[model samples]
Target: SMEQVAMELRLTELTRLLRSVLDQLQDKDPARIFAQPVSLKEVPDYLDHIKHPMDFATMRKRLEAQGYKNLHEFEEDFDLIIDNCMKYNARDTVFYRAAVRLRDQGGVVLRQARREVDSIG
Candidate 1:
């Protein structure tokens, strides 16, 4: 049916757009701290401070698993990653500054991706 086909096409475009956004984020993270889950041994108090932790690897896995139903859901995970970083690290630290930069710059990329996905619907 035409309706089913349109739905499929929109979902495909959404996934593609989201993947590109994720790639851009990973590239921006030169230190690659956010590339994978936080090591509990390395950051003992991380879980104590941050309730919900997110990372590029986890997001990629979710994306591959088709866990996101829409662009907003994908965006939420992106925001969560940055927010978690900022929350766990001190304001004067490198990790916090990096998260701030990523949020400021990556936000534009996300907005553009959202616009593109929104148009497909």
Candidate 2:
């Protein structure tokens, strides 16, 4: 999913920022501080006309309607959503997870983010 990859990039950006911001919030743990939702604005360009208001269920329906039922199908469509949807906001849990994961050697999540960035490049 493009949106996911983009979110990951955004998360990477966030992670880099978090590494700095944590220094400021020394009175607080980054996980505890960063585990909050960030607001996002609706962007028109990132949405499919028919796929407006993208949701897993809605997209699944659309794909099934078109005879797509596998993870690949959903993944392909999710990629479209990421590339299309502007109102994408990652959940707090995701950032929190990443924050907790920052110190692990070869952390798969961030490692994947690095790969995605390379692939995008």
Provide the overall lDDT of each model, using Cα atoms, as 2-decimal numbers: 0.85, 0.39
Cα-based lDDT at residue 31, candidate 2: 42
Each prediction's TM-score versus the true structure: 0.88, 0.24
Clashing pairs in 2: 1-79, 2-79, 3-82, 46-84, 46-85, 47-84
Which model scores highest in TM-score? 1
lDDT of 1: 0.85
Q: For residues 15-98, what per-residue lDDT tens digits would candidate 1 score against the true structure? A: 777788889878888888678899899989888898888999999999887678798898888898899988777999999998
Q: Which runs of model 2 end up more than 4 angstroms from their true locations?
A: 1-54, 63-66, 86-121
Off by over 4 Å in 1: 1-9
lDDT of 2 by residue, 14-79 (tens): 344333322333223344422222223444443333343433345434533443322244345433
Give the 10-residue window scoring lowest on summed lDDT in candidate 2. Answer: 31-40
lDDT for 117 in candidate 2 is 43
